[PDB]
């Protein structure tokens, strides 16, 4: 299959709560890049109490002899996604992602 | 210049929220994407009569939406909105007064979207005195 | 002509709504488009008896639909309808009097269709005087 | 495919609320025309509290080497539509529109 | 000749509806068409005791169905049924009286079919 | 010979229903067909205490099923069951008394099956005398 | 198709209610026999408040140049059925029946 | 396709409410006849609070070079129907109708 | 088809209630054996208020020239089943059984 | 040795049920088959305070499951459980007393499984 | 730092839970496994006014999750949390007091996952 | 079929409640190993009141002349599973497992 798109895996640092200040304290981020195959599932409209929102989904596929690094969310084309399904059939990997919003 | 009972307090609360520097919405459109916002839900009018004119109360409901890991910010916004609404004395043709015994603040988690959110719900009761 | 208690109030309120210049429906047909309108839902009758005749109260419910970005228009139409209905005193065979302590106005958002609308719900209580 | 029908894309101006008057104030509109392929999905009867209504849907398809301008709603044959789904498979575009009523 | 309270009041109300000239049903058969009709819903019995007899009240519910563009007809039929039921004095073995303070009439829209309809729901309370 | 309150009143009511000549069931088996019948649903027990014994009340619920075009038969069966239950005075180790003010009869239409049926629901309250 | 089974159509007489006695009074029944094609859909078990019951369904098919007499319920093999669907494609008739209980 | 069945289109006049009498006042009816193709979908049983009813559905199909007149309901063989779906693929028309009761 | 498995049909005796003792009294059982064809559908986990349970289902098929005796429940391989569906297509029989628990 | 308010009464009731000779479970593991049994649902604690201690009540709920055609057995087991729980006087560090005015027994039919069942539901209220 | 009443009591309860040695969460992340845990749900505020200040009460809700066959551990955790919360006297700018008459503990079973769990739900009311 | 993956069957000992201490007392565990065929169905995200969790499912297949030992849960690659379905078609076995957490 044709693999030309770029996918970046991001892992967040350790977190702990500071009761005096009342804020969460976090560490740094580690980013690793890779080139895989991605396809689009379409952007839908959903109606929520406060208004209307749009969310998209994408699928990432991988051939063997590739190891997936530990990660939390994935950045594909300036947007952050977070996985919902993870299937590993016969030494391959297939993932289904959905869009989320991450604090600046 | 002189509006109904609902619209007067609606405009006053909207103006206070805008002046505080917060982003105020009514049915947030699709094209906007940022997350520390306010939105107004609805009003309700009750009447109490006497031998000169008609009085009563007006109830306004609004909520504050924010990200999951930011609770202090949402609580501070809710408290600031309540305090600034507590200073309203008179509008164009009416006299108001906030009823403290019937205003409440409730915090909870909302997971109606793909992102976990924090919501604070406000209830305000204004008396025509 | 002397009609029943329900129909007399129904006709009087419908006449007032027509005379104010608004468009009024009982059941909106398919062929009509255009969003500023008034519709009547139903009635309820209660009886209180004495040693001469039978009295009680009649309750009527209406609604005002419109586009969302026009709230002042809907609120003004609701207030005008309430005020004009407050002046009804006598029909053909009955004496009425509006009860202010049980008349309320509520504003909310309705999203049953693809077009986000604004809804104002009215409750009117008429006492047989 | 045969592309002969007419599609107009409309984008609204900036909006802000005026507390003193109590009315929304907005700017002008920008309209751009194009020729694409459209098909019908049928007009259905729906029962709502106030009565009965009609609503229709259409699908717009586009081949590559065409860029869709930024828009809010689309006017096809004297009626205004607003999209519900947006899919972009392999440098192509396919949109599903649904009817909405817009203030004069 | 002497029945239970429920059946007695049921028969009396059904007789009044038939005598007024309306079409009355209990469970509408499939083969009958034609919109203006009256149907009876159910009955409830309550008991209040003293040292001689057993008394109480009987509650009867019924509805009037018709096309939507005819509201005056349905309202008039409901009012006529209420008034004629208000004149019942005695049956075979019982004495009745209508409780005006607990009888109500409600109109609303019903869309259970493809044909929009209007229903007037009646509630009657008879005191022994 | 001496059972609990629930089973005692259950057996007494079952015996009365059988003696009247009706068909009585607790859980209708699949193999039986025939529309006129009586079935018992449940029982509830409440306690009221004093310095010598423990008393209270027992509530029994049962229903009568039949075809739709036979209402007089169902009503007569319900009334007969109520009257015969009203004559229970004492069982093996207990003294009973029927509370008339809290026993009701309700008729309605049931369409759970293909055949439209008529159901009469009974509620009986027995007080430990 | 093979048509050897026997089907009897029954129509009930006029009904009116007698208020004095409190009973329904009915007329006579008219029965007409015919030979058509029937197939079985199976007997299912259902649980109701009072217990458990069994109900069966059957399908009756008819070729053209046969007219169906007016009827209320149908007796097939010592059991009474009452129809639920009626389709008439191209001068033909097809019916779906389901079992009910009729007073003796 | 074979088109031999007859279809009549009916359009109602103007309506306004007479508040003094409490009745609706209506105008005349305009009826236009045509010959098209119709097929049946079957008559089902529905259970409602007041009892049981029968309702039917039919489909009308039309080839190009035919213009459908404006209408409210359609009379097909002594029964009145009112449409539920309307699709117009490639200069053609297809409709799905349901049965309603119209005041005499 | 290959029919080698064993099926036993059981019919219970008459039952009546004894009000004085408060216990149900019943007669003896009649058992008849036969050889038919059975297949499995799987044992599932179900969660109930009091805990977790297991239930299984089986299908029994029979060719013509065999008459099924009257029965209540069926014992297949030391377990008792009770039928849920019964279909009789073209002088044949097919039954779907589901497991129950019977008093010792 | 000394447990919380909930666990003390839970253990005492479980011990009584075991001693009577019944089979008691908190969640029935699947491997077990056999119809006469007792299971415990949950507890609830209320506090009433005075100037010396903190008091209140503890509410324990449990149910009895059995086959459909055996009602007397289930009723007798429920009554025995109630009577034996009525004799609880003191645990390690607490003094209890059963409140009869809020203890009820209810019988019904349960059909969540393939086999029809008979369930008796108990509610017990203990006062500190 | 003076903070709003809600955040003040939230931080105090969180600090007590952390100091007791338990694991505390507000929204459990995906990557964390291991059963014994505490989580906070919500907060409600009411106002009562006089001629000098504005007072009222704050209600906090939290629950303890654990495996099914360990009830004593969950009950002990809930009781310890309640007792340690009962000792809160004053925060930065406020004076608090716990209302025993309106704080309850409830134990039940939760089966939203494949793993049967045990949950104890706490309710606390603090008076200003 | 190709059978190279390893599966361990675990059976727990007898359990009884010690009412004095309030703790459960358990015996030892018996473990038996085998080599069978396993396939993956994917790991999904589920949202629960306390947060988010991941759970997985796997399928185990077995040819005849293999007898499954009595067991409670199965350990496949450092994770413990518990079955949900069990089907035995024609002297074979097929099982569907779900992931659970077991006390250390």
Mapping DSSP onto H, E and C, the string for K35-93 reads CCEEEEEEEEEEEEECCCCEEEEEEEEEEEEEECCCHHHHHHHHHHHHHHHCCCCEECC
Round to whole Å and give the CA distance between I63 and I79: 24
**C103–chain B Cβ distance below 8 A for any pair:** yes
- Residue L61 in contact with residue L94, Cβ under 8 Å? yes
Q: Is A43 on the interface with D (CB under 8 A)?
A: yes
Q: How far apart are CA J111 and CA L99, in angstroms?
A: 29
**Residue pair J35/I101 in contact by the 8 Å Cβ criterion:** yes
C107 and C117 Cβ atoms separated by less than 8 Å: no
Contacts of E31 in chain G (CB under 8 A): 72
Residues in chain I: 104
DSSP G21: T
3-state helix, strand, coil in chain I (%, to 5): 0, 65, 35
Does F76 touch chain E if contact means CB atoms closer than 8 Å?
yes
Q: Is E92 helix (H, G, I), strand (E, B) or coil?
A: coil
Give the distance from CA H79 to its chain's centroid.
9
Q: Are E105 and E83 in contact (CB under 8 A)?
A: no
Chains A and H touch (3+ CB pairs under 8 A): no
Name the token pair of A38. 């991605």
Q: How distant is the Cα of K40 from the closest Cα of chain A, in angstroms?
A: 14
* 8 Å CB contact between A38 and A70: no
Instruction: Yes or no: say if E49 and F100 are a contact pair by the CB < 8 Å rule.
Output: yes
- Partners of residue H68 in chain D, C-beta under 8 Å: none
Would you say L7 and L69 are in contact if contact means Cβ atoms under 8 Å apart? no
Per residue in A79-102, is it b (16+ CB within 10 Å) or e — as a string? ebbbbbbbebeeeebebbbbbebe
Q: Does F41 touch chain J (CB under 8 A)?
A: yes
Distance CA(K19)–CA(A19), nearest Å, equals 11
Six-digit token pair at H16? 């306004």
Q: Note whether F16 and F81 are within 8 A (CB).
A: yes
Report yes or no: L98 and L73 within 8 Å, Cβ to Cβ: no
| CA gap K41, H14 in Å, rounded | 60
Residue A95 sits at φ, ψ, to 5 deg, of -135, 145
Answer whether E41's CB lies under 8 Å from E55's CB: no
> Which residues of chain C does B42 touch, with a Cβ-Cβ cutoff of 8 Å?
106-109
The two structure tokens encoding residue B121: 């719900």
Q: Say whether G75 sits in a helix, a strand or coil.
A: strand
Spell out where E1-128 has E strands.
24-25, 37-49, 54-67, 90-91, 94-95, 97-98, 105-110, 117-127
Rounded to a whole number, what is the distance in Å from the CA of I2 to chain G's nearest CA? 24
Angle in degrees, 0-180, between the axes of helices E5-19 and E71-85, rounded to the nearest 10: 130
Q: What is the DSSP letter of K101?
A: G
- For K30, the closest of L24, L52, L100 (CB atoms) is L52
Q: CA–CA distance from B25 to each of B36, D29, J43 (Å)?
A: 11, 22, 46
* K and F in touch (3+ CB pairs within 8 angstroms): no
- Estimate to the nearest angstrom the gap between the alpha carbon of G27 and the chain centroid: 19
Q: Do residues F6 and J120 lie in contact, with contact meaning Cβ atoms separated by under 8 Å?
A: no
Q: Please give the Cα distance from J124 to J42 (Å, whole number).
A: 11
Q: Is the dihedral of CA D61, D64, D66, D71 positive or negative?
A: positive
Q: What does the CA dihedral G60, G64, G69, G73 come to, rounded to 10 degrees? A: 10
Q: Tell me the three state secondary structure of residue L86.
A: strand
Backbone angles phi, psi at F81, to 5 degrees: -65, -45
Does G45 contact I at CB distance below 8 Å? yes
- Whether the CB-CB separation of I43 and L86 falls below 8 Å is answered with yes
Please give the full DSSP string across L32-64, using - where no structure is assigned: EEEEEEEEEEEEEEEEETTEEEEEEEEEEEE-S
Would you state the structure tokens that stand for residue B66, as one six-digit string?
């924010």
CA of D46 to nearest chain H CA: how many angstroms apart?
9
Which residues in chain G are contacts of H39 at CB distance < 8 A? 89
CA distances to H22, H83, L17 from H28, in Å:
20, 22, 87
Q: Cβ neighbours of residue L58 under 8 Å, at least 6 residues apart?
A: L38, L39, L40, L41, L76, L81, L96, L97
Which among H39, H56, H19, H34 is positioned nearest to H95, based on CA atoms? H39
- From the list F117, F44, F48, F38, the residue with the least C-alpha distance to F85 is F38
Selection from I1, I7, I4 nearest residue I95 by Cα: I7
L10, L13, L17, L85, best to mutate vs chain J, most J CBs in 10 Å: L17
Using alpha carbons, select from I38, D37, E124 the residue that is nearest to residue L90.
I38
Biggest distance spanned by C-alpha atoms of chain E: 56
CB C101 within 8 A of CB B47: yes
d(CA H4, CA H38): 9
* Cβ atoms of D58 and D38 closer than 8 Å: yes
- Gyration radius of chain F over CA positions: 16
| Closest partner CB to K104 (pick from J41, J42, J46) | J46
Q: Give the technique used to solve this structure.
A: cryo-EM
Tell me the sheet residues that pair with I58. I40, I97
E84 in helix, strand or coil? helix
Q: Tell me if residue J71 falls in helix, strand or coil.
A: helix
Polymer length in residues for chain E: 128
List the structure tokens of H44: 């089902």
| Dist. CA K86–CA J49, nearest whole Å | 13
Q: Determine phi and psi for I49, rounding to 5 degrees.
A: -55, -45
Beta-carbon contacts of residue A85 (< 8 Å; ≥ 6 apart): A95, A96, L42, L43, L44, L45
Query: Do the Cβ atoms of C62 and C122 come closer than 8 Å?
Result: yes
Which of H83, H84, H89 is opposite residue D40, by nearest beta carbon?
A: H89
Alpha-carbon gap, residue D91 to D67, rounded angstroms? 10
Residues of F in contact with J72 (CB under 8 A): 3, 7
CB of J114 closer than 8 Å to CB of J108: no
C-beta atoms surrounding H29 within 10 Å: 10
Q: How far apart are CA C9 and CA G25, in angstroms?
A: 44
Identify the DSSP state of E28: B
Which residues on chain F are in Cβ contact (under 8 Å) with J116? Answer: 27
Resolution of the experimental structure, in angstroms: 3.4
- The torsion angle over the Cα atoms of residues K108, B68, L44 and L79, rounded to 10 degrees, is -70
Contact in structure between A94 and A76 (CB atoms under 8 Å): no
> What is A5-23 written as a DSSP string?
EEEEEEE---EEEETTTTE
Do residues J81 and J38 lie in contact, with contact meaning Cβ atoms separated by under 8 Å? yes
CA distance H5 to G102: 40
Give the total residue count for chain J.
Answer: 128
Q: Report the SS3 class of residue J19.
A: helix
Residue D62: how many CB atoms within 10 A of its CB? 19
The residue to which tokens 């109260």 are assigned: C57
CA dist., res. C49 & res. E32, Å (int): 40
Residue D3's beta-bridge partner residues? Answer: none
What is the enclosing helix (H) or strand (E) of E17?
Answer: helix E5-19
3-state secondary structure of J61: strand
From the list J108, J12, J100, J9, the residue with the least C-alpha distance to J60 is J9
Query: How many B/K residue pairs have CB atoms within 8 Å?
Result: 42
Q: Do F114 and G98 touch (CB under 8 A)?
A: yes
Sort out which chain D residues have CB atoms less than 8 A from B24's CB and list them. 17
DSSP state letters, C25-77: ESSB-TT---S-EEEEEEEEEEEEE-SS-EEEEEEEEEEEEEETT-HHHHHHH
Count CA within 13 A, CB hemisphere, residue L54. 14
Question: Shortest Cα distance from K111 to chain L (angstroms)?
Answer: 11
Residue H100's beta-bridge partner residues? none
Query: Interhelix angle for J71-85 vs F5-19, to 10°?
Result: 150
CA distance I80 to I101: 7
Q: Return the closest-CA partner of residue H59 out of H22, H79, H85, H78.
A: H85
Q: Is there a contact between F23 and F34 (Cβ–Cβ < 8 Å)? A: yes
I72 and F15 within 8 Å at the Cβ level: the answer is no
Cα dihedral sign, K100-K103-K104-K105: negative
- Buried b or exposed e, range K32-59, using 16+ CB within 10 angstroms: eeebebbbbbebbbbbeeeeeeeebbbb
Contact F42, F30 (CB under 8 A): no
CB contact under 8 A, D83 and A45: yes
CA distances from H59 to D56, D57, H87, I18, L19 (A): 19, 21, 12, 63, 73
User: In this structure, are residues C40 and C10 in contact, taking their beta carbons and an 8 Å threshold?
Assistant: yes
Q: How many helices and strands, by DSSP H and E, does chain A display?
A: 0, 8
Residues of E within 8 A of H51 (CB-CB) are: 25, 27-30, 39
Q: Any CB–CB contact under 8 A between C27 and chain E?
A: yes
Distance CA G57, CA B14 (A): 65
Neighbours of C75 (CB within 10 A): 25
Closest residue, chain K, to B111 (C-alpha): K27
Measure the CA–CA gap between G85 and H43, rounded to whole angstroms.
6
The neighbours of chain D, by the rule of 3 or more Cβ pairs under 8 Å, are A, B, C, H
Compute how many other C-beta atoms are within 10 angstroms of the C-beta atom of residue C58.
22
J125: nearest Cα among J106, J103, J95, J110: J103
For chain L, the residue count is 104
Q: Which of I41, I35, I18, I15 is nearest to I26 (CA)?
A: I15
Distance (Å) of CA B105 to CA B63, B68, B123, F74, K5: 10, 18, 7, 57, 11
CB pairs < 8 Å spanning F and J: 42
Task: Please return the burial class of G7, using the count of CB atoms within 10 Å of its CB with bins 0-12, 13-18 and 19+.
Answer: buried
**Token pair for residue I78?**
């030391």
Q: How many other C-beta atoms can be found within 10 angstroms of the C-beta atom of residue B73? A: 16
Q: At CA F105, angle to CA F104 and CA F109, rounded to 5?
A: 145
Chain I, nearest residue to J75 by Cα: I22
| L69 half-sphere exposure, CB direction, 13 A CA radius | 15
């Amino acid at each position: 299959m044709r693999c030309i798109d770029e996918v970046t895996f991001v892992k967040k640092g350790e977190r702990h709560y500071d009761t005096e200040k009342g804020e969460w304290i976090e560490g740094a981020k580690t980013e690793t890049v890779a080139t895989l195959n991605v396809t689009d599932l379409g952007t839908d409209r959903s109606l929520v109490i406060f208004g209307a929102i749009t969310q998209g989904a994408k699928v990432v596929r991988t051939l063997p002899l590739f190891n997936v690094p530990d990660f939390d969310y994935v950045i594909i084309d300036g947007k952050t996604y977070e996985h919902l399904t993870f299937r590993s059939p016969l030494y391959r990997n297939s993932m289904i992602f959905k869009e989320v919003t991450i604090e600046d | 210049m002189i509006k109904t009972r609902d619209q007067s307090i609606f405009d006053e609360v909207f103006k206070q929220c805008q002046s505080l520097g917060y982003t105020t919405y009514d049915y947030k459109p699709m094209n906007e994407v940022g997350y520390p916002f306010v939105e107004i839900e609805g009003t309700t009018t009750n009447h109490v009569a006497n031998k000169t004119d008609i009085k009563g109360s007006v109830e306004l409901t609004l909520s504050v939406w924010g990200l999951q890991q930011k609770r202090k910010q949402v609580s501070d916004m809710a408290s600031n909105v309540l305090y600034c609404s507590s200073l309203i004395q008179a509008t164009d043709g009416f006299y108001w007064s906030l009823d403290y015994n019937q205003s409440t603040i409730q915090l909870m988690d909302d997971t109606t979207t793909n992102t976990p959110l924090k919501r604070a719900r406000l209830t305000l009761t204004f008396t025509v005195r």
